[model samples]
Target: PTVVGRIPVLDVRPVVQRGRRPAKAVTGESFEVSATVFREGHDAVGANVVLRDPRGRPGPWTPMRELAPGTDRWGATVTAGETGTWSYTVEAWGDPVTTWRHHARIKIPAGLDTDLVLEEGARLYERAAADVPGREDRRELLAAVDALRDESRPAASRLAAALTPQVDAVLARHPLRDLVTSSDPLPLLVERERALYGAWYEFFPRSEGTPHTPHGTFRTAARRLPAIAAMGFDVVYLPPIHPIGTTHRKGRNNTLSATGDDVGVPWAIGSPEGGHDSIHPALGTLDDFDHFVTEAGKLGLEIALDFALQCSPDHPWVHKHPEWFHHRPDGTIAHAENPPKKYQDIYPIAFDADPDGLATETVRILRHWMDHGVRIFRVDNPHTKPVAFWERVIADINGTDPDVIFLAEAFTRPAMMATLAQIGFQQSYTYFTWRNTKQELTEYLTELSGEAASYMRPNFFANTPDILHAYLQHGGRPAFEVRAVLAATLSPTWGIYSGYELCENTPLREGSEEYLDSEKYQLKPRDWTRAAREGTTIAPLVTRLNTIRRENPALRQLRDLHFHPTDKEEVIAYSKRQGSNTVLVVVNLDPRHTQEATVSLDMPQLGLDWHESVPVRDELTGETYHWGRANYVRLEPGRTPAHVCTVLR
Candidate 1:
């Protein structure tokens, strides 16, 4: 009698945690998931479910848990080992009820500017509508958008009639895309909206790795593309891949002393194995480097290499072109040193080193890397070199490869940074380090947003290898987390040095602002599990901040960065605006104090009613808050030092 009947399962659907998808990072993230079990007649229970691992086999089994009466619900963590095709399956069980299963495919992919714009806009529109308590206009707007999505209603015409002046009001002074893609809609359409996506990817991955390293092979770097893409990073930078010098060898971590086993810094560009043009033997061949570039392109990432014109004490150029470096009175070339800091391994080239030959050779250095498919260069300590050299080099390189991008890593005077930008570098590392105080931030940002806007493209970096600041050492975990949030939202092209996400704040010495036993002095891999206070690490916050950056174009627009002078010295506030998106960032610079301050605002910029309470969302927590245009911002140490909250309604 039990075998006589069977129930045909007609349809099935999954409920996702309605919010932005996860961003790319090493740390795994979690979100809630629920699926509805449907059948033609008989109620289904005691069912079996299986989730396939994206890598190979099916994951651990998950039993059906009962939902309303006979219906069932199941929840489990879905791990995508890496970016690739992923799948999920659901099945119903019980002898008399019959068993049926269905499968669906998902592609883990990188972040796109189009998706970011649409998602942020949708969040803003929906949240504003939902919070308008009994406002029929808000309800009408919601219905119009939904009806427009369905073919069943005369939606487009109804939508237009419903949204007339109200749509204009929504976008009047805000950053709203004018383009209408199937996935994203706009209040007003503009040609620039259509062009924005193309412009985004055109320079997205402007720089690739300049060299290969033993720490991570080219494929290892390539595997990061999807995650990097998910973080909205278009450029994947690599250090130089040229053969390292074995002569007069320095110890690990760039110690002045020598060792037999130490692999010298990649900057010291040649050895018996080969020269600047050849790949390191341990880092795969030149073909592998090319293959890495091709793979990166598929994931929407571009490769950028570091370009340092200086040679090692043992670079083949030492013999082949002895005129390139500065020489001592005794005739041996001098090692590059920074007063107390000695780089016995590296040799600085004389700016006047036979200008004709040096100039020609520098162009060749760029051309050689271009031959290997590298398109972007992060010029090392560029200010140390002559401005004339960069002007000529950039001219020659761009003439051959117009798409080539350069990032000048100049940590010297502001004029030096500005000079490189004027000459032609597309972006420059900024003084984000010293700008920790509110006054410092306001003054610095005002210059960048106003006076320096013409040529300089400031790419903010919260920390760098050579930089070991008091902020990281004295500030601790909450400080580090707050710093990451600030870095991600503060600039369109900001990046964290490797150890930053691990919250490795150990200083080189007591009361010193350098990382303890620094990486520049040795090779070290991060242990992500090492717990900071409250089990928080840099990975989760890094991933979340990157997601916020990618999902909001208003966040991506670097210009118009305005800083407000808050009443509290420890609290720093700033605002970024694009078409219709306005984000306000409030950070507490003090590591120990719970700071409270009134953050001033120019209400007109946000397109919100001056005296009315407006809904705002913390992009990182997915928490919505309501605020009047004029309000105070209170930041506490317990809640972390900063917040990048986007105004949603």
Candidate 2:
């Protein structure tokens, strides 16, 4: 029985052990594979992560570097080689006796005793030389063996000196083996169809045109998508397209009173038309929806549907599967309640009541959408649902359709959020919308691209229907430019609500993050053409930022983030690099005033020398500059508050 002698490897990212699940990744993206290795009998002299194909064809082993001076935690980079499901495991070997013998083999050749030198050389060559690949290497190794076996001390010493280099070469080629390996082969799923690095544009289908008898239809919405595609957004996200509930329906501005013409909140999911499987009649029929998908696809955009698990009181599930709902003492199904916030119109599904039925129906609903052209689902408030349930549904959908993607909208506890991603969500909304200060932004970006990069992919949303940050509400148009540049450049995947380009950041009231007369409960038809023609919009800036993102590979990664020091606290500067692609981003956090800073670059990490000046061009302004170790920059808020610079050849 193995007690404390068993080698241990823990804290592996993208591989959650509790649920026996592996996290996801994309093709050509670099991620860190880390683990803590230890053994009671002997110290871990060497450790590495071995990536292999499904058929046991292993790639080169990447060595794990120790974190601190004497820490047991080790980590290494494992860039995805191919687009498929690959396997990786941690391996480590420990043997103090063999380690000392290896070093002695070299030292004895230098000037040690002849007998010990021959004895160690024979043992090392016998065990290691057997695996040498080439004939020339074997011949040289055999000569060392012969020299050690001879009785003459001078001859043996001379050959030993010459063989030291050969011994080092052999050891470098065929390193020591791992006496311990991971208990299981961890899974690593990779895909290119999933846009882990792209822009997302969120809009409501019913608010696409001027209000008429019903509302905007799918055809009307399709006509407006060319502008969205021209802005370079690859994914077009829509609110719930299913029928709205009638009972307890909210009116404009989320008032308690609901009139006959009031369109219920989209989050209140079903009606007489059908449940989650049916689209709202106002949004058009199935055929029209398919046409919209085709048109959007023609523009190189993929449609993403809002997958709200909760149903409206009028949903067919309320009547068909009564067991899926919780009942009160009076035998009436309970409505969803969050203490101060009561959602009488919405009904939350009780997964524990009928887990089997829930799992079956959820997968069927998701597949129905996938069957039609929807490959991405922005799951609404996933924190309210069970993590186990999500794990099951996501895995089932991805089993056959690897191209499908799930974005978790969980803004709850950090641990719960991270667990949802470890299970299967490809992307998750981040807290960048609220981080406005220079220090806050820097620290958060560091955490996102540092320790959390392996498992969590952050999708920055500058503003959402539900979240209207105070900075945006009070900072004016300059604030919009500042936040947009930061969000677009700081993270690979970022999003914007419909009115973000028009600088819509009004709150219902003070001390709230909700929009006034929210589009959630009512139709909000905007004059987009007028706004663009009048030169009163930021659409052009957004178009430029997205174009830059598409052109630069450095901005499309999370692991290559590095921050530099700015002399002024009001300014923040950072850089992202991937191989030969490098980008330097500097922003002025202050929106009301001009800020200047002397930024110091981290030259070593940037592959530059302190004595050298690097030529760079700003993608935002088309301005060129030769930057040394320390560079001076000044940004006026109303003009341009940021610089997205690319290193020149």
Candidate 3:
């Protein structure tokens, strides 16, 4: 604590949990590192972010520049090229040589403090000459020093000698650093590529079987992997495959009583046979799951298993460790109840009671699956649990295996969702499903793409098992297209529940978001081939959207999206840029009627000026159009609700 350096580095940003945990980042995801680096007086101060590996080996320094003239705020954009835990520190140093040169040049030219300023400049150059690398660089600095101290030469001539472009170049490359100070290392966990960008397709493995019966095994699920891969989906997500509990098992549509043939909910994990670490008997053995993982890998798809940290009433934990669950005063274990609804089949783990036991068991279960090649986990309702509990478990899992990833399925308040990501969640479920209108979408998307992008990687799922939004419920097939298009293009990571392509939007009732005869309690198998053959499925559009995203690198970025003005309220227009690659999206938010509007493009965002026009080709329709700052667009719901336009060189 006593070792305080001369240069002060303050207010470093992109830090998480007051520097207790690592901030999140994916490979090649560029994030800005900003700091308030200032010094006492006239001496110039500079800052750079120095990245070090686990072994304390540092890479090249990324220099930071002042954001504005009067701000004294320095920032630099940096990216982790590969996946690993990296430690980044802000290095601030006093640039005394440059500071002396600045005052010497100004004062000497006006004949003010000519002798004193020249002497100071001479000493600074002399110091810089010895510190600079390479013989040629040292020679240039020595020549500048000689010019500054020369009594025969005029003050103006000596100042000009040191101000030459050659001297400036050498100084820029190898400046003399004084009182170099390094801030404490902050953790930045660089995640895999899928952590930031992917197309996730979630379907129940139990519903994938056809020939034998409704109860599907891992073997039956492997058959659906090829079709998902053919649709250009990168990840195949499955519901929990552990044993379902029998006590208080819900019947069809969440009925209280269950008959003999009824299979309980999958989220109600654990029964007499096994728990989280054990495979459901109906889903086959661990060997079958391994084969399924391999088959998906051959198709270039990763498997994301659901990680539901709860137990059924008959779970092994209930009998083994009573302390793991909250008990009422009468010595009875309590169930999950949110006042209006009761989850009698499921019991929330009492994290406050036995954190040590729960933490140890969670790590064991996660590692057991990791050993079986399940690298991705989709955690269910993480917001219900304590943040400290998640941080410890996630840190332990990542520490043991860096390849593992955890997706937080928390659809709660803004602060909690963002905090989950800030701690350690690789990806998070956002409110994108319910964000229907153009104004809502634009504002929410802007927040996701702003500073929040650094810590929170938003994964926009059009629909989930429990969510059937009103927009999709009544907007018909055209609504599906509009939502799917927006979800796929607006964020790097987007997903769809299994029935999305089939436009299954029937809710349990008029006011409920739950699907009719919800799959949570019943078997709902689908016919993918028949629907595609009869031209009733939106599979083709889903395939096309995924194809466009993979073809254009611009759509894979989160921070580069910019929304422009549209004449019509129902129409939305936005653009994303990466180097020379650019994509423009104009969608009609209203699903019923056709939309016509004049879109005023932000030309500079597209690498063009306000007066210039760009030749663009529609990625979805292969139609070419010339677009400028002000352009006309007409989108019909039944035909094309959106135009994903790519700029033609």
Candidate 4:
């Protein structure tokens, strides 16, 4: 625990919450483990990282190399082969053999302690040989020791004899480590790959067939699963399929008065039919929901249900557990509010009042759905509750159901959002929904794909039920295409609310970001047949982008993004790589106009020599171009606003 050990190893990262929580990683995702390693006098210290698999099993020690000359920072890339919490720590030690050689090379030639330095080198080699496990390793080390002890050899020749390449290899692998010190074990949580990579399609279950018929049953909505899966989406996110509160229910566009047959928003969860554990009676019974999950599973799609912890005014929890709801001085329970924004229909849970009860209920509700084959949950506004609650609930679920994953839908302050991810949430909603400029995107994306990536796996949604960015509101169909490409290419996990494909861009008002007749409240269904025949939708492009994402291993990875220079302000260029599979993306951020720019690709970053040229085939549209470091690109709005290219190599 001390700041300085014999060979001090500190600043171990990517540690979360000062190493109190597990650092995040998806199975098969390689991430660099770095730490500050130094010593009192720099006696040729070396470092190696040792990883333990789930269930406390150790792997081979991987050697670390210095990051830069004169810097004490050392790093080694490591990966987890399976899911669960793993432990890894760095071992720093004084390399006595290498330290001896450092002095021997200088002292033996200078005639200072000539015989003494040679004798010490021979002694160190003998000690190293005694511990080496392999037959060949011991033989090589002993042979070097014998050569150093031979008096017929000159002083320089004697030192050189012990420095044979075979001897050096043996010693390096099995160092006669002096004062071997290890840092405290830090956690590495390896989750299923879907936690990091997936193409998600979100829809309100009731809206799937509500246009022909709010109130569409599970069988009606289940019919849309095939079309969603055909578009290459891996997950189907349904916004709460539970009962909606009738009392104080929000009307269309969040209006206070719910006079008519206006269906309530799904987030104001729970009613008399039941609370968090019950399915909406209108949507169907437990059997109907099971069929929906089963059907989607058969289509290679996993169902992700929304987990909104708060409740509606008429929720059974208020009656069953009065202590769980916050009480005012006047004795009436408080409603959800944030100054000017009031959620009259929703009631925030009083977690501190009964922490144990709330946590137990949360786990029970999740397990109920998990039993019916729902493995993924998108937690709504998790920042509103205590972080400890999430930490407790996630561990409880993961302990029994390793396949379960939680996506924290917390678009809040940096500290809160980051803490949610640090505690346990596998995926998080990010600022990607709001940042819409070239500079803003470059800055936000660079941060998302950087160190924050270790603890936070971001799920980018171009448009959600609550947000309708101005760029999409005014930029029209081309704007949708640009955003889709950016989201699909930049982040491994990305999704869109149901109406995105239909180009539903009318905001609540000119200044407001909410959709005009938002899908959050009323069951406003889309005309799928009209869009298909008239071609007013970007469904085809969505399918193409999803297809490209599925096909390219590079695009399915995070932390491998590199940005390059573009000649025009409207254009942005970047590349991603996994092994030899590299993908280059060029986007014209301007949704209305055509922009041509000369993109200067970092050839080395693309796994190419600087002077070499190659033909890049556009996966979006079947177009090819001969490209080198600097090449011209003209991106138009309609045909293709970006070039999703794969190098010939």
Q: Specify the highest-TM-score model's number.
A: 4
TM-score, ranked from best to worst:
4, 3, 2, 1
- Give the per-residue lDDT digits (tens) of candidate 3, residues 1-649: 6555678887787787788767767787777888888889877997898877656778675889999998989998887767887888899999887788778768887899887888888888888888877899999889988888897999989888888999988887777788898888888878888889999999989888776677889999899998999999999888999999999999999899989988879999999999999999999999999999999999999999999988999899999998888888998777786556688899988887789989999999999988888999999999988998998998899887877889999878889998898878989999998789888999999999987886888899999998999999999999999999999999999999899899999999998888998888988888888998998889889999999999998888788889999999999999998777899999999999999999999888677899998899999899999999999999999899899999997
Find the candidate with the highest lDDT and give its number: 3
Candidate 1 C-alpha lDDT tens digits along 1-649: 4421233222222211121111111112111223554445442333334444335465454444444664445433333233322344544433221111110001102223323333333454564456444466566546544543444544234234333576544423221211111111101101111111111111111122334443555655565566556545566666666777766656654566657656566777777777767777766687878888898788766677878777776678788878777777898987877667776778888867588888787788788888877777878888878997888888788766756777898877877777787676767778888787767777787776553543556677677767767877888877787767766777666776666766778876777666766554445544334544545555666767767776776666555577765777888877887656788887888888888787766566566556767777877667777766555767777476676788774
Please count the clashing residue pairs in each candidate, in the order shown.
27, 0, 0, 0
Report the Cα lDDT for residue 261, model 2: 92
Could you tell me the lDDT of residue 345 within candidate 3? 95
Q: Can you write out model 4's per-residue Cα lDDT over 422-451, one digit (the tens) per residue? A: 888899999997877889889998999888
Count of backbone collisions in candidate 2: 0
lDDT of each: 0.59, 0.82, 0.89, 0.88
Worst 10-residue lDDT window for candidate 2 reads: 154-163
Q: Which stretches of candidate 2 lie over 4 Å from their true place?
A: 1-15, 36-44, 82-85, 94-110, 114-127, 136-171, 176-184, 191-195, 210-214, 331-334
TM-score-better candidate, 1 vs 3: 3
Q: How would the candidate models be sorted by lDDT, starting from the highest? A: 3, 4, 2, 1
Superior by TM-score: candidate 1 or candidate 2: 2
What shift in Å separates residue 241 of candidate 2 from its native position after superposition?
A: 0.8
